[PDB]
Amino acid sequence: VTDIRFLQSRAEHERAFTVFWRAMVGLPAADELLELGRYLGAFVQGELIGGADSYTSWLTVPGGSRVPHAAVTHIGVLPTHTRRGILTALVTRQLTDIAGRGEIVASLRASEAVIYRRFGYGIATSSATYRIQRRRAAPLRPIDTGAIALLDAAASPEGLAAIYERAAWTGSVARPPQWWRLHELFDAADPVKPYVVTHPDGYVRYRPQDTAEWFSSSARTISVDDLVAHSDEAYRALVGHLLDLDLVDVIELGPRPIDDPLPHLVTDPRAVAVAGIRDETWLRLVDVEAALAARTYTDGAPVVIEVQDTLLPHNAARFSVSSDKVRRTQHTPDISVDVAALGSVYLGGNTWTRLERAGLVSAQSPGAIRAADALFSTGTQPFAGTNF
Amino acid sequence: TDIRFLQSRAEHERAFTVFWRAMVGLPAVAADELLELGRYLGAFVQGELIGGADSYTSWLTVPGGSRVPHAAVTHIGVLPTHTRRGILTALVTRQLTDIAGRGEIVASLRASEAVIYRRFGYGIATSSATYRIQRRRAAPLRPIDTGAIALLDAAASPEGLAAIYERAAWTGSVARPPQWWRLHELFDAADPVKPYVVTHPDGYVRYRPQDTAEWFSSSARTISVDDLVAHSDEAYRALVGHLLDLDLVDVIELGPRPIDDPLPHLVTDPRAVAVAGIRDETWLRLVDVEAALAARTYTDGAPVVIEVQDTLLPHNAARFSVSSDKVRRTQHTPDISVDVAALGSVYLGGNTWTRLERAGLVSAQSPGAIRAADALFSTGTQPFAGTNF
Amino acid sequence: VTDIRFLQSRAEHERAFTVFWRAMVGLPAADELLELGRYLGAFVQGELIGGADSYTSWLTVPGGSRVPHAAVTHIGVLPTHTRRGILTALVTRQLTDIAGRGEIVASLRASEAVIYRRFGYGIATSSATYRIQRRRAAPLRPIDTGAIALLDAAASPEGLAAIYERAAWTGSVARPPQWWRLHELFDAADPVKPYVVTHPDGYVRYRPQDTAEWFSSSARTISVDDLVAHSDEAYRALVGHLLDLDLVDVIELGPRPIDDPLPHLVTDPRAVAVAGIRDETWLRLVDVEAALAARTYTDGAPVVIEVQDTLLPHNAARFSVSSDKVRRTQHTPDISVDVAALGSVYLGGNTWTRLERAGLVSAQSPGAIRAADALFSTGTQPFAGTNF
Amino acid sequence: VTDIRFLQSRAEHERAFTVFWRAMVGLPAELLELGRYLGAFVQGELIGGADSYTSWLTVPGGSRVPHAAVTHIGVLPTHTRRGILTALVTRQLTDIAGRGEIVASLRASEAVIYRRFGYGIATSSATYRIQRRRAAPLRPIDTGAIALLDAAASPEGLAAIYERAAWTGSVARPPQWWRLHELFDAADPVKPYVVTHPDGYVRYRPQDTAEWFSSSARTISVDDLVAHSDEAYRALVGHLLDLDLVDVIELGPRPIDDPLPHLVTDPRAVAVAGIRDETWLRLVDVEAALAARTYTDGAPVVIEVQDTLLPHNAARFSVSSDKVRRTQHTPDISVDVAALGSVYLGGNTWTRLERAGLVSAQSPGAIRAADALFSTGTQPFAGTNF
Numbered sequence A, C: 001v002t003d004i005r006f007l008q009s010r011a012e013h014e015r016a017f018t019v020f021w022r023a024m025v026g027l028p029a030a031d032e033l034l035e036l037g038r039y040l041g042a043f044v045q046g047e048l049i050g051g052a053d054s055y056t057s058w059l060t061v062p063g064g065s066r067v068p069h070a071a072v073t074h075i076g077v078l079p080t081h082t083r084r085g086i087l088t089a090l091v092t093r094q095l096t097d098i099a100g101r102g103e104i105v106a107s108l109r110a111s112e113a114v115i116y117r118r119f120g121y122g123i124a125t126s127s128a129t130y131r132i133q134r135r136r137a138a139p140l141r142p143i144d145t146g147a148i149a150l151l152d153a154a155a156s157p158e159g160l161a162a163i164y165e166r167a168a169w170t171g172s173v174a175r176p177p178q179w180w181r182l183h184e185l186f187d188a189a190d191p192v193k194p195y196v197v198t199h200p201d202g203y204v205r206y207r208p209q210d211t212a213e214w215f216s217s218s219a220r221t222i223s224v225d226d227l228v229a230h231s232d233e234a235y236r237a238l239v240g241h242l243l244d245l246d247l248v249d250v251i252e253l254g255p256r257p258i259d260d261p262l263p264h265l266v267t268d269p270r271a272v273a274v275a276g277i278r279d280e281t282w283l284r285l286v287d288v289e290a291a292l293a294a295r296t297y298t299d300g301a302p303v304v305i306e307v308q309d310t311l312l313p314h315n316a317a318r319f320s321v322s323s324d325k326v327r328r329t330q331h332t333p334d335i336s337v338d339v340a341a342l343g344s345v346y347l348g349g350n351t352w353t354r355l356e357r358a359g360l361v362s363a364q365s366p367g368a369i370r371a372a373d374a375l376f377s378t379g380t381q382p383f384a385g386t387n388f
Numbered sequence B: 001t002d003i004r005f006l007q008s009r010a011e012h013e014r015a016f017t018v019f020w021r022a023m024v025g026l027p028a029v030a031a032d033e034l035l036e037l038g039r040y041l042g043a044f045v046q047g048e049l050i051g052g053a054d055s056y057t058s059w060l061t062v063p064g065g066s067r068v069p070h071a072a073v074t075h076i077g078v079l080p081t082h083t084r085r086g087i088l089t090a091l092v093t094r095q096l097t098d099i100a101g102r103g104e105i106v107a108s109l110r111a112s113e114a115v116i117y118r119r120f121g122y123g124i125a126t127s128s129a130t131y132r133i134q135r136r137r138a139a140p141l142r143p144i145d146t147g148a149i150a151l152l153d154a155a156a157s158p159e160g161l162a163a164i165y166e167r168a169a170w171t172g173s174v175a176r177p178p179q180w181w182r183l184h185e186l187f188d189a190a191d192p193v194k195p196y197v198v199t200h201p202d203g204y205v206r207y208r209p210q211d212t213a214e215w216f217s218s219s220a221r222t223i224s225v226d227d228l229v230a231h232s233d234e235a236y237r238a239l240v241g242h243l244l245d246l247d248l249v250d251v252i253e254l255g256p257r258p259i260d261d262p263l264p265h266l267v268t269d270p271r272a273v274a275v276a277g278i279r280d281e282t283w284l285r286l287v288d289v290e291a292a293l294a295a296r297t298y299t300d301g302a303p304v305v306i307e308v309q310d311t312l313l314p315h316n317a318a319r320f321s322v323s324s325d326k327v328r329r330t331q332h333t334p335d336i337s338v339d340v341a342a343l344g345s346v347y348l349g350g351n352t353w354t355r356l357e358r359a360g361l362v363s364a365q366s367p368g369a370i371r372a373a374d375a376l377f378s379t380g381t382q383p384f385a386g387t388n389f
Numbered sequence D: 001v002t003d004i005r006f007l008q009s010r011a012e013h014e015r016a017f018t019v020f021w022r023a024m025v026g027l028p029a030e031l032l033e034l035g036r037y038l039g040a041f042v043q044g045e046l047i048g049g050a051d052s053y054t055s056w057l058t059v060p061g062g063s064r065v066p067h068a069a070v071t072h073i074g075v076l077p078t079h080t081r082r083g084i085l086t087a088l089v090t091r092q093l094t095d096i097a098g099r100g101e102i103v104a105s106l107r108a109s110e111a112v113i114y115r116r117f118g119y120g121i122a123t124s125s126a127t128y129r130i131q132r133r134r135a136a137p138l139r140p141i142d143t144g145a146i147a148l149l150d151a152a153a154s155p156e157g158l159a160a161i162y163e164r165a166a167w168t169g170s171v172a173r174p175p176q177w178w179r180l181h182e183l184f185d186a187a188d189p190v191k192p193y194v195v196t197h198p199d200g201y202v203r204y205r206p207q208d209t210a211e212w213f214s215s216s217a218r219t220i221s222v223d224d225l226v227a228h229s230d231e232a233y234r235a236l237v238g239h240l241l242d243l244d245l246v247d248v249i250e251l252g253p254r255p256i257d258d259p260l261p262h263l264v265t266d267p268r269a270v271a272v273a274g275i276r277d278e279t280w281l282r283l284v285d286v287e288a289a290l291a292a293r294t295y296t297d298g299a300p301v302v303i304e305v306q307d308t309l310l311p312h313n314a315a316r317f318s319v320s321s322d323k324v325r326r327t328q329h330t331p332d333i334s335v336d337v338a339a340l341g342s343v344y345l346g347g348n349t350w351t352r353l354e355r356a357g358l359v360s361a362q363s364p365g366a367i368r369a370a371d372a373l374f375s376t377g378t379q380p381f382a383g384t385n386f
């Protein structure tokens, strides 16, 4: 009755866009936004009623390695065909196809947080929203900003793509040409054009809010939609530019890392308030063995992790993880966990102790948890400054 | 201007009114019930007491579980008629030197303003979070065993809850002396809404219903959890599971809680748990840096040499070789340079070396020096106190 | 000093539109949206300074009969000519002209509730606005939905007009071609296009709200502007479709009947909240005898209602009303009421007991009020769902 | 394991109160009728309960039927989802039947609890906000019989005025109810004004008194308006509209069809600020309830009632203005007892419940004939909570 196959014609590609938009209901150019050969379709009695797509991408794992990543998106089923196992059919077929392509991880941005964990996706990174009261944000230590250059209207999508390409922070994802084309359209839809300030090692985009009432007796606020900084000097210089921007009362940064050292840049840490925290990267480990081997660890003793994976039985095994070697093992495990929770830990956005506390990790010794956290610990919280 | 310790009870009573004046907006009990007799410092100009700073004999749990001698600093304040004259600096300098002589190695406080104490070496070492849970959306991801849960609402005593709290082992946890419990006896008496107290063999939870006059209103029946003590993973799930299953409750507000509280991982809908706010908590001041670094545990990494800057306590201004095996003073060239305030921020695991280096508070001489230091100091849980003073 | 005549030129029709817009102050080709030979103009010293218009329409009265109805609208006088009796002159001529056309009722939508009762208009229907918390709205009984069809971009204004034409609910009014052309203009101006879902016996139009901030932690809301259901099965199927939309958090229905059985469709009636109730149909009985005879009654004993009418003395008489016959009588009345309050009861939107409680009905015999409610009682609250 | 019995000592009744308060969680901190409180005991400890009061309820036609005012229902959170409430409700309803009472009603804390037991939403209440400056009377309103009785009001005197209540949906206010409201009035520092009429009274309290003499909207709140006559109703409301310092008058709870908008020249001065379910009605004896109410001079209709908890009501009833008896004739209408309760007081019609899928018709005119019989002129309303 229901057939799941890859889309193959421009007519099928265009219909999948209409189907995906319909399922999203409230989402605000034709097929120059897609990558040919990765769009799955769900057909009942002939008509296309759902689908799931992905893009060839990479993902930066702890240690800087850039792993093959499938950026899953465009998932949706028409309301006339929901609750029939169609998404499950799409996701199972998609992950198997992602595996055959040599890709090691897949990630998405969930429209609802109750959908994808049953398929092995785990919340691996989170994002924060900061509101800075600029009048209270004098820098604790001097900030240079000498290399700052204004590029407001002269900025191009090709120039910002060149700066972003050298992104090295953990959790960062590829921004293909199709992603920049999509944001060319978003920029055209907003009448307020964004300011672009650059540094030799980064840039920052910001837009004024309620401009019709700028001179009012309220908080003139700007909104930063992208902050790319490949060096500590660039991070401080770019942030320092905002703290020194005249006429600005409130600076809103979002999405930003949950451990962004904004409170440590100012004499008054309370000038920086966290206005919200949200789940970001839903990571699905497609090849668990290859994923664990692509990431780096600390000089600890090896720990054996038994992973449970129902959709991909190839990952259901025991792995000895160490800074020296990652191998399949038959030794008794130190930790047993499902692939979804392993994905939550994989990028460093969660620890083994906290997932065990929630009841998602089974330990054989109280110090097995400590040993595993000693290996997997990272210095920065992972963060994907990009949505798709 | 004379800075001396208070001695007579009249001076202790006057220092409380002086502290209340400095706080301006703080909400009848003898001062001796809430004070430690030999620990209150006073600031005198002419005969008049115009400021002071106090502390309590306490402990603090550092990474590794060790319970370190800790000075719970509080009651700090100067009258507005004597501010900007160096009086607080004289109080803090005398207080920190006295804390050192008592053999206590750390001091912590709760700052009324975030712009006061970093100049004295205090660093934000822990933070607290506020969660709002939409109970209808918070069905447990895995089944939660609540059979050991017992209702103890009116039968709870300050002495009985103190016995459960004493077994606190989480990093950042601080002592709750009898004076702390006496103070919260008064806060409970002032509030007409009495709190529910639900217990588990390894913990307890206190919660209070909000706007009771409009309880049956359209919607948004909220409860407020002011204390969640759980010494076990099973106790943690049972106590939270008790909250998620409470009938008639629409919104559950937890605060203050650890910033890494695994509430989003307990429920099928992580977005049923929303972070409503994050605030600085522990302002930590390392009084004996060497003894503090030696009391905590580290991972099996290579040693790192940290050069510490300390202006108030030059005894700490030195170079320390930090490793899981030994912590000693060294003359070797350092791998990392930091002031004592930022070292305090990292000490409990609430900050990493990379993020402080990014803010310009850490100077590295090798690229991997930061990575090596974070490998040693990293911890699995964010530090958290859950108690104020 | 003041001349009242019908407009006859397109230049006059265009100015009457400018006068009406000026009188409305804050309201957002005109001959395409107008019906000629029905627009009255008020001329002072030659210049057009006010007017009153109407459309040839019908109105569904209790029992299903479709009576000749004058859809009055476009009433307005310039602020430089108010409080001079011009509206009273406009309304008197209009109602007399409506009477000569053989039309028996007139209705309008009042901009202010203090204007039209002095002319015999009474509030005959009211409308409600519902907000449904979708997560709490599981159906009490299973609702089928196989006959539901998505028709979003394939919908035509002509097709929905064909579905609306079968309207049989009490209070429903004609939607002339001019009305649909007017709503073509509203739909073209809004960049957000509406979803159109159909059933063999009805349809429903809905629009997503704040689409720019759809994925944020704020309740994703849709707004239903039209719900047409000619059968209980169509009503349940269409509403059931809304309750099953996967990404929707809040459903707003409005305007809807004040007795819409939404709370009885769900296990949690409090998932449906009434966000407001407002007067809708201002009904004016032009031919009281013909109106009373066109509607149906219950098998009760006749009651004699004495109607007071100052503008139209043809209605100032006593009428013996029963399920069998409606006649003029000289017998002593059982009930005395002005035509304005009779209009309020005429569609079933009010009862005789409550209007007597308000002091608008006088009873001359014991039990006359009780008897009158038995005849005039209806099972459904009247409702138009259409504005003009 | 779990034992369900009636309480027998005041010590048990008092703990049942604390257990009820515990289950209610956030309810604010003698008041009982002995011999009507059911308790749930596991190993000698009381962990749940359900209580009721001897009361009456005004059904269409004015008849005052024996009514069980259900309240105090609650189970400790350590013993929920084990069938204890179902055991309490089953025992309670069978006990209500044995006492000769024909209806039971309650005020539900959650709307998702009691329908499975046959309770139906029979009345709803509304909250009105009147912009007093815009509320001039449409017709002149007399008020010479209005008398200020503010501090001279007594619980015993006001209870005598309420006793003459004849509107459909009204319930008895026992002495225990007035004692409970004596306690609420003593706790509130703002004492209520009490204005009387020969046929009614009205209680009102000023809102936010601390900022009265200079703010945006000085509002008063009317918590009780009892009026046994059209003249008393207009006089009492007219008194409120003529209070010189009041900007906004808030009435609640009031009937959903309160003719306030028809009293003023500006109907939009009266806004509906909210609508909430009120009476959850459970027909304990369907036949006797159908007989106690009045109907119009229509043709008989046969109603088939479904009732799982009380099979005595599972039958077919011929309803007419002359006679209500059990019959074996094929029914014209089929309904479960919960939905029949929704219509019983006139707060719902057969057409709207059928449209919601709660009524099945066997004849085309059966729905229309049933509405002809059951129609009432006033929406039912219980100006009282318990």
Ligand SMILES: CC(=O)SCCNC(=O)CCNC(=O)[C@H](O)C(C)(C)COP(=O)(O)OP(=O)(O)OC[C@H]1O[C@@H](n2cnc3c(N)ncnc32)[C@H](O)[C@@H]1OP(=O)(O)O
Binding pocket: A023, A024, A072, A073, A074, A075, A076, A077, A078, A081, A082, A083, A084, A085, A086, A087, A088, A089, A108, A109, A110, A111, A112, A114, A115, A118, C246, C247
């Ligand atoms: C990467 C992105 O683009 S995120 C965008 C996701 N898309 C949307 O939100 C569009 C709107 N929604 C939809 O299109 C659909 O509801 C989908 C795709 C989310 C789900 O499609 P379905 O065909 O209904 O899924 P399926 O039948 O396989 O359900 C599998 C299980 O997940 C559950 N489930 C699926 N979707 C949801 C949901 N939205 N909320 C809660 N539970 C869900 C089902 O109950 C079922 O559980 P069960 O096995 O215990 O019965």
Ligand SMILES: CC(=O)SCCNC(=O)CCNC(=O)[C@H](O)C(C)(C)COP(=O)(O)OP(=O)(O)OC[C@H]1O[C@@H](n2cnc3c(N)ncnc32)[C@H](O)[C@@H]1OP(=O)(O)O
Binding pocket: B022, B023, B073, B074, B075, B076, B077, B078, B079, B082, B083, B084, B085, B086, B087, B088, B089, B090, B109, B110, B111, B112, B113, B115, B116, B119
């Ligand atoms: C643990 C606790 O209880 S926290 C409670 C702290 N108490 C209060 O906040 C009460 C209100 N404030 C006060 O009483 C006083 O302002 C105090 C105690 C904070 C400071 O007392 P002072 O006598 O003015 O301090 P002192 O003169 O030594 O100032 C030292 C430096 O800190 C600065 N400083 C002190 N307080 C503040 C403040 N509230 N805001 C900003 N800067 C301050 C001074 O400007 C000075 O800086 P400088 O050396 O560059 O000139």
Ligand SMILES: CC(=O)SCCNC(=O)CCNC(=O)[C@H](O)C(C)(C)COP(=O)(O)OP(=O)(O)OC[C@H]1O[C@@H](n2cnc3c(N)ncnc32)[C@H](O)[C@@H]1OP(=O)(O)O
Binding pocket: C023, C024, C072, C073, C074, C075, C076, C077, C078, C081, C082, C083, C084, C085, C086, C087, C088, C089, C108, C109, C110, C111, C112, C114, C115, C118
């Ligand atoms: C169907 C629709 O389109 S409704 C749209 C109605 N139009 C508007 O609201 C536009 C703005 N207003 C206007 O154009 C004018 O004020 C109108 C049309 C409301 C009234 O026109 P006028 O020529 O001033 O009316 P007119 O002089 O005949 O007044 C008759 C009586 O009604 C009263 N009246 C008229 N309008 C109002 C009002 N808005 N508020 C209160 N009373 C009014 C007058 O006071 C007068 O009472 P009186 O005899 O006791 O002195």
Ligand SMILES: CC(=O)SCCNC(=O)CCNC(=O)[C@H](O)C(C)(C)COP(=O)(O)OP(=O)(O)OC[C@H]1O[C@@H](n2cnc3c(N)ncnc32)[C@H](O)[C@@H]1OP(=O)(O)O
Binding pocket: B247, B248, D023, D024, D070, D071, D072, D073, D074, D075, D076, D079, D080, D081, D082, D083, D084, D085, D086, D087, D106, D107, D108, D109, D110, D112, D113, D116
């Ligand atoms: C008249 C008055 O006083 S109203 C006051 C009502 N009391 C309260 O609201 C206090 C808070 N709630 C409680 O104490 C309890 O939840 C009670 C009393 C409502 C229910 O007690 P329980 O022992 O859990 O009821 P019980 O186990 O018999 O449940 C019977 C059914 O109703 C359902 N149910 C019972 N209470 C609820 C509720 N609050 N929400 C949703 N469903 C419920 C159960 O799921 C069960 O359904 P099922 O047969 O499909 O599995």
